[PDB]
Design a protein around this ligand. Sequence first.
Ligand SMILES: CCCCCCCC/C=C/CCCCCCCC(=O)O[C@@H](COC(=O)CCCCCCCCCCCCCCC)COP(=O)([O-])OCC[N+](C)(C)C
Ligand SMILES: CCCCCCCC/C=C/CCCCCCCC(=O)O[C@@H](COC(=O)CCCCCCCCCCCCCCC)COP(=O)([O-])OCC[N+](C)(C)C
Ligand SMILES: CCCCCCCC/C=C/CCCCCCCC(=O)O[C@@H](COC(=O)CCCCCCCCCCCCCCC)COP(=O)([O-])OCC[N+](C)(C)C
Ligand SMILES: CCCCCCCC/C=C/CCCCCCCC(=O)O[C@@H](COC(=O)CCCCCCCCCCCCCCC)COP(=O)([O-])OCC[N+](C)(C)C
Ligand SMILES: CCCCCCCC/C=C\CCCCCCCC(=O)O[C@@H](COC(=O)CCCCCCCCCCCCCCC)COP(=O)([O-])OCC[N+](C)(C)C
Ligand SMILES: CCCCCCCC/C=C\CCCCCCCC(=O)O[C@@H](COC(=O)CCCCCCCCCCCCCCC)COP(=O)([O-])OCC[N+](C)(C)C
Ligand SMILES: CCCCCCCC/C=C\CCCCCCCC(=O)O[C@@H](COC(=O)CCCCCCCCCCCCCCC)COP(=O)([O-])OCC[N+](C)(C)C
Ligand SMILES: CCCCCCCC/C=C\CCCCCCCC(=O)O[C@@H](COC(=O)CCCCCCCCCCCCCCC)COP(=O)([O-])OCC[N+](C)(C)C
Ligand SMILES: CCCCCCCC/C=C\CCCCCCCC(=O)O[C@@H](COC(=O)CCCCCCCCCCCCCCC)COP(=O)([O-])OCC[N+](C)(C)C
Ligand SMILES: CCCCCCCC/C=C\CCCCCCCC(=O)O[C@@H](COC(=O)CCCCCCCCCCCCCCC)COP(=O)([O-])OCC[N+](C)(C)C
Ligand SMILES: CCCCCCCC/C=C\CCCCCCCC(=O)O[C@@H](COC(=O)CCCCCCCCCCCCCCC)COP(=O)([O-])OCC[N+](C)(C)C
Ligand SMILES: CCCCCCCC/C=C\CCCCCCCC(=O)O[C@@H](COC(=O)CCCCCCCCCCCCCCC)COP(=O)([O-])OCC[N+](C)(C)C
Lengths: 168, 82, 1105, 41
Amino acid sequence: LPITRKFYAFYHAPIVKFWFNTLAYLGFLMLYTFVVLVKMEQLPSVQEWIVIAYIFTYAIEKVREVFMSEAGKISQKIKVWFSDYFNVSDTIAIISFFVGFGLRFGAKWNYINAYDNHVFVAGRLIYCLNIIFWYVRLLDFLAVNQQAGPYVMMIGKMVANMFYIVVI
Amino acid sequence: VYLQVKAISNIVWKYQRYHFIMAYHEKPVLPPPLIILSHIVSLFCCVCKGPKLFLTEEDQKKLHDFEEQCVEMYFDEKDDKF
Amino acid sequence: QKSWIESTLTKRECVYIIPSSKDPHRCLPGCQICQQLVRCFCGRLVKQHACFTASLAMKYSDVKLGEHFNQAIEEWSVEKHTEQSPTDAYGVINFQGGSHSYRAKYVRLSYDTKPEIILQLLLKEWQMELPKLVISVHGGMQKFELHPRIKQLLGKGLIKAAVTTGAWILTGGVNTGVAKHVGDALKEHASRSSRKICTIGIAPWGVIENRNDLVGRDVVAPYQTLLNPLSKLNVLNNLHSHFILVDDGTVGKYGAEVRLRRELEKTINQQRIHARIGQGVPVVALIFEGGPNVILTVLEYLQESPPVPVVVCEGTGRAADLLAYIHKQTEEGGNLPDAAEPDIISTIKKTFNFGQSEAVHLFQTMMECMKKKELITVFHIGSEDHQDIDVAILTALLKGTNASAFDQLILTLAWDRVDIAKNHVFVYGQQWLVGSLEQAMLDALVMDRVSFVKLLIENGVSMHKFLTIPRLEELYNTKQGPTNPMLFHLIRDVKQGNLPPGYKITLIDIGLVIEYLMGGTYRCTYTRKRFRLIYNSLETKRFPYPLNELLIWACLMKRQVMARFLWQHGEESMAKALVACKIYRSMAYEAKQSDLVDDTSEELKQYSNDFGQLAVELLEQSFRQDETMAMKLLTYELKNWSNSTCLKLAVSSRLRPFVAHTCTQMLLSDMWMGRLNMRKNSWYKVILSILVPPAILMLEYKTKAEMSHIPQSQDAHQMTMELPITRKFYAFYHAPIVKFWFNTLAYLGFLMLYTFVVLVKMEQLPSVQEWIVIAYIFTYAIEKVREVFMSEAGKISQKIKVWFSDYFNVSDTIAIISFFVGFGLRFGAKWNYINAYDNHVFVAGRLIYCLNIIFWYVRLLDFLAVNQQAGPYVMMIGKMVANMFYIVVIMALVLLSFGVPRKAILYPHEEPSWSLAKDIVFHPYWMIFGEVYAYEIDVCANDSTLPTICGPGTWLTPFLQAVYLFVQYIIMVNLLIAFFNNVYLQVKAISNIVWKYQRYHFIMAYHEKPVLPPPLIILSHIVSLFCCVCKGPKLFLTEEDQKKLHDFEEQCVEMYFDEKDDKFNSGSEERIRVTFERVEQMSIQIKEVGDRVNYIKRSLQSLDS
Amino acid sequence: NSGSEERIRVTFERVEQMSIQIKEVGDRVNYIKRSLQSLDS
Ligand SMILES: CCCCCCCC/C=C/CCCCCCCC(=O)O[C@@H](COC(=O)CCCCCCCCCCCCCCC)COP(=O)([O-])OCC[N+](C)(C)C
Ligand SMILES: CCCCCCCC/C=C/CCCCCCCC(=O)O[C@@H](COC(=O)CCCCCCCCCCCCCCC)COP(=O)([O-])OCC[N+](C)(C)C
Ligand SMILES: CCCCCCCC/C=C/CCCCCCCC(=O)O[C@@H](COC(=O)CCCCCCCCCCCCCCC)COP(=O)([O-])OCC[N+](C)(C)C
Ligand SMILES: CCCCCCCC/C=C/CCCCCCCC(=O)O[C@@H](COC(=O)CCCCCCCCCCCCCCC)COP(=O)([O-])OCC[N+](C)(C)C
Ligand SMILES: CCCCCCCC/C=C\CCCCCCCC(=O)O[C@@H](COC(=O)CCCCCCCCCCCCCCC)COP(=O)([O-])OCC[N+](C)(C)C
Ligand SMILES: CCCCCCCC/C=C\CCCCCCCC(=O)O[C@@H](COC(=O)CCCCCCCCCCCCCCC)COP(=O)([O-])OCC[N+](C)(C)C
Ligand SMILES: CCCCCCCC/C=C\CCCCCCCC(=O)O[C@@H](COC(=O)CCCCCCCCCCCCCCC)COP(=O)([O-])OCC[N+](C)(C)C
Ligand SMILES: CCCCCCCC/C=C\CCCCCCCC(=O)O[C@@H](COC(=O)CCCCCCCCCCCCCCC)COP(=O)([O-])OCC[N+](C)(C)C
Ligand SMILES: CCCCCCCC/C=C\CCCCCCCC(=O)O[C@@H](COC(=O)CCCCCCCCCCCCCCC)COP(=O)([O-])OCC[N+](C)(C)C
Ligand SMILES: CCCCCCCC/C=C\CCCCCCCC(=O)O[C@@H](COC(=O)CCCCCCCCCCCCCCC)COP(=O)([O-])OCC[N+](C)(C)C
Ligand SMILES: CCCCCCCC/C=C\CCCCCCCC(=O)O[C@@H](COC(=O)CCCCCCCCCCCCCCC)COP(=O)([O-])OCC[N+](C)(C)C
Ligand SMILES: CCCCCCCC/C=C\CCCCCCCC(=O)O[C@@H](COC(=O)CCCCCCCCCCCCCCC)COP(=O)([O-])OCC[N+](C)(C)C
């Protein structure tokens, strides 16, 4: 097999696209964990810019997934994609992040002490809560294993079945 | 309830492994930071220019035989057991 | 042309047009009705020709101006006047029937085709396998329907002799009479012989309907089953799978393919039935309900090189029945009684009116036939006369060639028909040649014909005289049967990689493979010096135990059914079952460790696990018979299997059900005791007698006769010849039970000291405890080095890789290496004299001790795992840690999903610090264990212990922690309870077996150990080095006890096979099914005795007359 | 006695004995139908 053919065989394999996305996603959380645990100044740090860029482009991808999906009726493609658990979480996670960035970046810094501006606080506290969506999304990557994945689906089938015991 | 939710979850897991694997044939090659290049390149070639099983005509013949031969063995072995 | 056919085969087009009778039918104008009517002496009218020589000729008159001189009318012969041209009809017809689209392969060839060409088409193009038999059916047409029973029998028998002998039933094709009954017979016994019987109808292109439809080069051409309401024409029949559509002229003329059928009845005769068999493919003729020209055709067969015999089916029809009676009423090989012509010619007359002009002319075609009775056969239907025609047909080709029984046998061997060999070839009076059954055996072994290998042994073939070196070399170097293609990949991997093209495998090369697949110190009979000499020189070339050399052959060639045959034959059954388990297990590992399209490992591991179960089921058989001798069956040296041991072979294959069998576990229990009877002693007294030496001489030992089934050391066996005092101490201290408790007390005393050194102040120099402690670990390490050297396979790397596979032996190296780092830092460090722990080399040394000790408590689980109850729980713990892994990874993610939002909301003003990696993980982990941090929740409350953390957004954290614990405690901890409850029983069953299995390696390690524990062991080490530069257990039987044991082995294998059938036969599934089959046979007979009595009650009023 | 294991096994053993006899009464009647053309003499 020639050389340039041998690269086209690697990068276009679904196994490679996976691990090439996991490392970007794990590197993404390591950065977004860092931005959320460390002091957040007036302007976003280089981490937080790398982090916004991911979520922005990650959202362009989801839009592209919905268009290039299946049955040409726009409403059908919609109703299919919003039936998976994590794809609902992705929209809340994407929408919530750009509210928080709008409030974070769109806010008059006080210069005496941060967190006297409640637009700024509200922006950060959305980040600190939006990140929960992005750890739980690792269960979608871990659900690629033959042993792990059935436990992940199982958790939810049990939460639904224990409901009435928990109401008592 | 463990055993029966574990049996359902193994099947729902195996079933959703189609939609997952087949979604990673359509995805670009670059992950979501650098994906935008792949997006732009796919818009360039949109205003400038899924997987299928290719058989030669003799392999289609050998396959339709295999289909027929296995249906025969199915009905034959169903009565031979009954 | 993209078809071998078109370049090769042709058609026939009647280029030349000739008059008919010359009468224009009626209707005065004659010139044009000549065009309307005149069937060419071809047989199709002038315009049906369409020929190019005859297309632009009708304008003038046609071919042949005017009368053409009556002589020359008698000149159309297709040869001069009909042209060979490219085929135009070859494809696949399709029949319209219930769920079967029955296919075929029509060809449309000229009758002039060379007979070589035909057989080629049949074999390569149509991809047919050369048959082991050809049943050419010849009979009469439109023979309405046979009687119900006689149709059943000719419908089961033809199918049974064609499905078992892979035969080509050559036919006529026309759906009338013969092909009509052949086809219905196929349909009544189809789908068991569907893709096994190939039925070639050789039909003419004359009497053929939808003739124009079959035309079409390379097509899936259609075809019907609606018999044309008006027509004398004939339709091809449903179930014929192939068609030879000969063409010379047109419709009618149903006599131009007869010669071509004869060609294919010849060209198959010149092919060899099998690559090893010299006999030609047989050909037989089957007559049922014939015709006037059958008895002519019958005559032709029995007068050729060689005489194609004939099997006639009386009771069906006219010619058969005629031919039935005549040859039946014949002299032994000749003429008749006082002239029988009056009845014969009268009998011939009623079938066919001939009338003494040619009714005599039949008597000549009817004499040479019956004169050849030896070649003629007849199936007397309704008289159990060779049990449908399958016996009779196949029999016909064995009795009627005056052939040697060597050839008659080999034909059955190519047919795989043992019954016809055992009932007609091995019959009384048969006289064989010196080594002819041997040549049959060699062919049966190569061809993988187990049922003939059985027969040839049962009659007289001795495998001791049979099996030689140059022969048993052949058996490896064959491609004429089921082969293991990996045997070359193995013989490559041992002979450095180089295999020349020929490379006739040698037994020495097979010995090298058996050493590599059996591993360790195994030395085969083929790699020895005594064989490499006799071998390269070439009773001596005959092996002493031949059925042990072929068991390996059948296994290396992946021939299980032959392996499961040759195993019952001979002795050392349980040994061979555990070898085979080992050969297939290693063959399987090297198949998975290689690149290949067919993995052939689930096949081999199943083959391994099939013999592994035979050994266990024979051990359970020996154990239920005698327990003491069954334990002896585990430890006697084999002497044909590299001085090995049936137990050692099972441990070599990780065949846990055999080592976990109660017999081995009870022998293992008795080797643990030693010479001590721990049934009339207690562990209190063993410990007491270790601490009080003279209490060794007050406890109960075992006699020499309670130690005969136990493998011993030589020195131990030399002290069973005499018990004196110094002998009584040698029996105590060398018992594995005593070496254990003598090591536990040193190890428990070791931890008590090392616990003391680690809890108490550690001064500049080590205390007397810490010196005693270092000494142990130092000498304990010397022991582990000695364990690795004196272990097993001489390859240093193997001994390494085995010892580092046990859990605790990995821990021992970390524990030993870590201790002498800590001692090097502890002892190698400048004491400060102001206060210790200002020197960080010294601290680091102590903190390694304080952590190294964890290795040494956990090592007590290795001592506690000696108990039958405790040990399976210890192995179980680890099997569960591995299985709970992914639940705990989810629990670690819910942890970080909570600790990162919490630390971020409660500590917003943090610069980057390593304390951020603790605080996201610390409190959320201690929450899993019931610490709620109650007064840190709601940091803005009045009872809060973190009142300074109160700020914007901190009201979120109690909501977050409420979700957190609900997930961790109410879902995830209880999911893990649910996990354990539903996996408990099966991990507990595995752990009991893995426990019982590893009790071999443990007990057998305490035979090799010195007598002194790891502090004082160094004496035993030194003494063992002194006697190394100055100077395991075996089962000793006397020669009469070896005799009594080989008997016990034989007797228990017999009881195993006997009791296996006695259970199978005495089962309701077997008793319902043979009852089922008898009630069938009876019912048939009851409606036949019921018929006869209906032919008796008619004979009450006839006798009344 | 009133169990299927016992009723299959004695049925099994009777069908054996019968079948033997049915191929012996079947033999005798084959030695009777020969005695239709002999008595005919
Ligand atoms: C599957 C895929 C799904 C896709 C889902 C995607 C959904 C995306 C959803 C998006 C929702 C976005 C909501 C943002 C909220 C803004 C409010 C705000 O901050 O107001 C403040 C800033 O007001 C300003 O005008 C700031 C202007 C400078 C900053 C630029 C804003 C960037 C917006 C981001 C663009 C996001 C890009 C989105 C890309 C996707 C006002 O507060 P103040 O200034 O303190 O007081 C003003 C009053 N005064 C005048 C009296 C003083
Ligand atoms: C299955 C079986 C497997 C077997 C596995 C066995 C594996 C065994 C593995 C062994 C690894 C051993 C690693 C030890 C680390 C030593 C480093 C150290 O302490 O350095 C210090 C002492 O430096 C000295 O030179 C001290 C010399 C006196 C003490 C003697 C050391 C004894 C080593 C024990 C021999 C162990 C015997 C092993 C027997 C087996 C340096 O620090 P300092 O002095 O405070 O400062 C110096 C700085 N200055 C120069 C500027 C002043
Ligand atoms: C198969 C099993 C393998 C393990 C797998 C799991 C990986 C485990 C990895 C865990 C990460 C821990 C990283 C430590 C961060 C640096 C620590 C440090 O700098 O000093 C601290 C170390 O001293 C201590 O006392 C704390 C040590 C951590 C204890 C962990 C307990 C929880 C277990 C968690 C288990 C759940 C894990 C969930 C998944 C991630 C001391 O305090 P500080 O403030 O940090 O620094 C000093 C400053 N000061 C003097 C002012 C105080
Ligand atoms: C069953 C029992 C419930 C009854 C039903 C009715 C609901 C009742 C609720 C009603 C909400 C209104 C209460 C606000 C009171 C005034 C503001 C105030 O004091 O805020 C306080 C906090 O609280 C907050 O800041 C807001 C809390 C909102 C979440 C409440 C739960 C929502 C419903 C359920 C959600 C579950 C999920 C929903 C899906 C199912 C501020 O006080 P602090 O925190 O001590 O800090 C002050 C000091 N500082 C200035 C330094 C910071
Ligand atoms: C979108 C796709 C992302 C994919 C990744 C690619 C992008 C990543 C590449 C580059 C981005 C990083 C830019 C760094 C800029 C400098 C920052 C700075 O000033 O100092 C910081 C340095 O930086 C760090 O310590 C790293 C911060 C992020 C933590 C996670 C890194 C791993 C994740 C991603 C990679 C792993 C791969 C994951 C695969 C398994 C901190 O400095 P400090 O010394 O701690 O400060 C002293 C503290 N003091 C003041 C209290 C004394
Ligand atoms: C499509 C999806 C939904 C989008 C919803 C819309 C989102 C955008 C919403 C709102 C627009 C932003 C308002 C601008 C602020 C005006 C007041 C101001 O100037 O500053 C004041 C802010 O006082 C506060 O109380 C700020 C609270 C902001 C957080 C609330 C939004 C949470 C969104 C829910 C999450 C949704 C996540 C997505 C869920 C899927 C005070 O600061 P200052 O003025 O600088 O100085 C002090 C002056 N003062 C003391 C005299 C007061
Ligand atoms: C610069 C960077 C350098 C490199 C970076 C290295 C990064 C390392 C990255 C990842 C670590 C895992 C490596 C093991 C992979 C094993 C192989 C595999 O594919 O197994 C499975 C895993 O399939 C997955 O999709 C796993 C996804 C892991 C991401 C989730 C992290 C969990 C964090 C939560 C925990 C919190 C604690 C986290 C710590 C704070 C899939 O295999 P399978 O489907 O079974 O197919 C085989 C089937 N067969 C056996 C029949 C053939
Ligand atoms: C701060 C951070 C905290 C930690 C983060 C933890 C992250 C989360 C961790 C793990 C997530 C597990 C992955 C889910 C897998 C998919 C399941 C799915 O699609 O839906 C499942 C259901 O729906 C659910 O199960 C909903 C999600 C359950 C999360 C549990 C929240 C409980 C807390 C609230 C209480 C708190 C009390 C306190 C209140 C203040 C599928 O169900 P089904 O049976 O297939 O079909 C349903 C239909 N039926 C009903 C007819 C059967
Ligand atoms: C390598 C294999 C080893 C095998 C064992 C053979 C070697 C063992 C033999 C001898 C070694 C011991 C030498 C002792 C030297 C004197 C020490 C000293 O000065 O005082 C110590 C005395 O000693 C003890 O109290 C015992 C210390 C070890 C702890 C337990 C040993 C038991 C295990 C081994 C034996 C049983 C085996 C059990 C088996 C089931 C302590 O004195 P104190 O009075 O506490 O101090 C007052 C405290 N105050 C200052 C605060 C007031
Ligand atoms: C083959 C297996 C691997 C072996 C690895 C190699 C092992 C050997 C490793 C290292 C060799 C020893 C180095 C000597 C110390 C040099 C510094 C010194 O002299 O003193 C300094 C010590 O300062 C420290 O920080 C000491 C820390 C020592 C512990 C680290 C080793 C842990 C090994 C991991 C465990 C592995 C266990 C085994 C795992 C299987 C200071 O003390 P001082 O000088 O007296 O006075 C103060 C002066 N000062 C304040 C100005 C500074
Ligand atoms: C100077 C000194 C004087 C004497 C000292 C006396 C020293 C006393 C020494 C030991 C105490 C145990 C004595 C009971 C023995 C019972 C008999 C036996 O063999 O049972 C089994 C134990 O087999 C073992 O190997 C047990 C090993 C014990 C060491 C682990 C200690 C646990 C510490 C952790 C706990 C922490 C707490 C620790 C304390 C802080 C083996 O038997 P079996 O395989 O079942 O074979 C019989 C089968 N049958 C029934 C079918 C026939
Ligand atoms: C300080 C003192 C602490 C207390 C001391 C305790 C001492 C320990 C006590 C008892 C030890 C139990 C004896 C083990 C028996 C042998 C098992 C074996 O060989 O391996 C088993 C596996 O591997 C293991 O099970 C590894 C050992 C498990 C120890 C548990 C550590 C968990 C802590 C970490 C988390 C901490 C979180 C916090 C992080 C900071 C066998 O597995 P298998 O199934 O046969 O085969 C595996 C292959 N498979 C995967 C395909 C199935």
